[PDB]
Amino acid sequence: GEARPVPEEYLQTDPSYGLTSDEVLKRRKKYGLNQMADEKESLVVKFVMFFVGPIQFVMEAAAILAAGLSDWVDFGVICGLLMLNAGVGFVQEFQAGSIVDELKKTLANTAVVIRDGQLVEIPANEVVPGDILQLEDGTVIPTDGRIVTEDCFLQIDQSAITGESLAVDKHYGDQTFSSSTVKRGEGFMVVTATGDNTFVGRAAALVNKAAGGQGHFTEVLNGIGIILLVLVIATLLLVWTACFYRTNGIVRILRYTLGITIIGVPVGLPAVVTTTMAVGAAYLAKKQAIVQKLSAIESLAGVEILCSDKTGTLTKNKLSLHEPYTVEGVSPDDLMLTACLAASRKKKGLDAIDKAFLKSLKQYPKAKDALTKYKVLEFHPFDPVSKKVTAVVESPEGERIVCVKGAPLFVLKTVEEDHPIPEDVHENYENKVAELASRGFRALGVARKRGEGHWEILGVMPCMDPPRDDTAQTVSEARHLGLRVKMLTGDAVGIAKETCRQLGLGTNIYNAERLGLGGGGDMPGSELADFVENADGFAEVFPQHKYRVVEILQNRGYLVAMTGDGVNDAPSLKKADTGIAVEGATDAARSAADIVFLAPGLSAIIDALKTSRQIFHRMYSYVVYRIALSLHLEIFLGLWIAILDNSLDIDLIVFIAIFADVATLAIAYDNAPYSPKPVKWNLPRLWGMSIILGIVLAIGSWITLTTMFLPKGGIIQNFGAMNGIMFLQISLTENWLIFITRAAGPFWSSIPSWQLAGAVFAVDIIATMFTLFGWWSENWTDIVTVVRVWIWSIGIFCVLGGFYYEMSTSEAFDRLMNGKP
Amino acid sequence: ESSDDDDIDALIEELQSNH
């Protein structure tokens, strides 16, 4: 993070001669190339990484167990499931990264340097510290440096770094940054850093540092998987105690252990969750939002703070004019016209100010129509000393008119030096200039003169970063969704405050450096966290301060999304639970942002929020379903093995797992309603609901089983096989539990989608054929027995519906499970 | 000199096309 400072001994390069080729070679050897390390991981390593997870290790162990026990169907199914999961995830993330590699545009970099006393164009990678680089109009600065031309005035656009869409004026001795564009002026700069040492270089270093960090979704999933593994180990301990106490054979013990491990560990949990997230990602891409990391979709569901860059994300990147102040008797059309005649008329080489004036002319038809009729005679461009552009023009009536556009105070002084202004006009002028400066507007005073007449001052033209047309409707819609919008920016406190006031945001914008985000503030940690939490934004924010604010907000338990465009933001994009790169973001920021917007503006964050909440609803429904599944079958089979030393046939257990997984894969397309409030994993409530549902299912299955021990068959009528019947009843109730967990209230309230209903019905049909034809069962079963099983399963399903309704709507149950009273 | 480099009205229309 600390830039290795190039000693000043190496920077005293004579500008008239530059560096020598031998010196170039030495410095290249000592400091390497001017190219950041572009480490991007490997595809095979990533495909392998998909298998590296807590649940995936337990399934690898289970597959090894199946291979050892010669149950090749078990091993083959487990490996097929694992490869399907990894393939789905890898394919989705490859599709996502293809877009990132697609919108890449930055290339054709060539720096013009003084070497051996001659100007030579070299590739941007060959520049070395101490070099003398030529800065021209439009030159993209490749390396950080310090200007060395004494009588030099540069205007350099640093929006890519500090967010400022406004060309910073740079003089002799001022620092320049890589990737900044020289909007005006000519000069020479001595290089001071290269590669990773550059400001952009250090930003990319922080990006590649945070790129190895895990996401909140993954930690929640890992916790669920670890608790399920703990429950499985408890059930295996019970089973093994029971089996030992019967002097049971090792082979029988290992077969039961394989059966319990296959079911109690959620094989398809990562797969179905990733598939739901991938379908949601495709929906977003249709909504013009491209998700890089699927986990970010979950994070964007529970995100409660959206930290947005001011410039390029919340605002536009054009120095747009606002309502002009006019002196009495001066029409706004007249002031627009006069400001325009004091502008360059050449299509090439237009300044930002003149460009904004010309663009605002659309709203002033009289000025537009009058501009063409005036013939420009002489034009004196922006002189930094007098700080005013001047234009001597000839009117269609033959009158010569001098127009001036400069600083409000300089133009006021120019007018005063010719004739005295009324005091009232002077005070109103200065008061409005002060208001505009406080509001952060870059005011531009305007004046004219007709023939030999006196100077007429016309007024002031504000010039600020305009809010994007679709931002207020997207900063109010986000707030309607329980989301708190906080601005972060490098612009001055005043400019950020005015932009917030114009966006409707809060005005409590604090200078980030002064509040201590840099670590130098005496404020205690908890007080700093509270200030960060309640502050309405931060101004003069360096990349490290963005990272610090995001880190503090995350440490307070908030899921934080963040938006930005420059590499400077990228550390906060990757650090935030949901890094959002807006249109026009740099390749580094895009590679750091978890979601990349492909259309201009910040309008696609509300559809992203809704779709993320729908995805979370589907994922939560599936997770509750599967935890209930695991607890149900763990309890049932563990007690069955402990009590009667017998368990459901291993093939039927494998098929139960396959059926549950494949039926749930269709949850990804379910029409889950969106939550109105930001949604979090209420894990204690989730686990309580799943435990109760599992106990109810276990009781139902145990009643069904114990009906078959009677000498007449009980549930069996005429004839039937116990293993097949238990398989059928288990499959039916387990499948139908999904219709229960997916509903926000009574299970009939949300009509099931046709994809999920058809999948569940098909699995029920296939289980029914399995039982009827006795596949991997002792014997066929009578059809009336199957009908009885179906009726019993329907009853258990209604019981589960009552239980889930009561538990879900119960605040008291939630309090009880969460420890509260 | 770059003198015959004009017709800004075209530029006027071109610039605010984002409307």
UniProtKB/Swiss-Prot annotation, chain B:
Feature: compositional bias, Acidic residues: 1-12
Origin: domain of life: Eukaryota
Compartments it resides in: Cell membrane
Post-translational modification: Phosphorylated on multiple Ser and Thr residues.
Further comment: The prion state [GAR+] is provoked by the interaction of the two proteins STD1 and PMA1. It involves a complex between a small fraction of the cellular complement of PMA1, and STD1, a much lower-abundance protein, and it is transmissible by non-Mendelian, cytoplasmic inheritance. [GAR+] makes cells resistant to the glucose-associated repression of alternative carbon sources. In contrast to other prion forms, [GAR+] cannot be cured by GdnHCl or by inactivation of the molecular chaperone HSP104. There are two plasma membrane ATPases in yeast. This is the major isoform.
Family named by the database record: Belongs to the cation transport ATPase (P-type) (TC 3.A.3) family. Type IIIA subfamily.
Function according to Swiss-Prot or TrEMBL: The plasma membrane ATPase of plants and fungi is a hydrogen ion pump. The proton gradient it generates drives the active transport of nutrients by H(+)-symport. The resulting external acidification and/or internal alkinization may mediate growth responses.
Subunit description: Interacts with its cargot receptor EXP1 for its transport within the cell and maturation.
Name of the protein in its database record: Plasma membrane ATPase 1
Portion of the parent chain present: 36 to 54 of 918
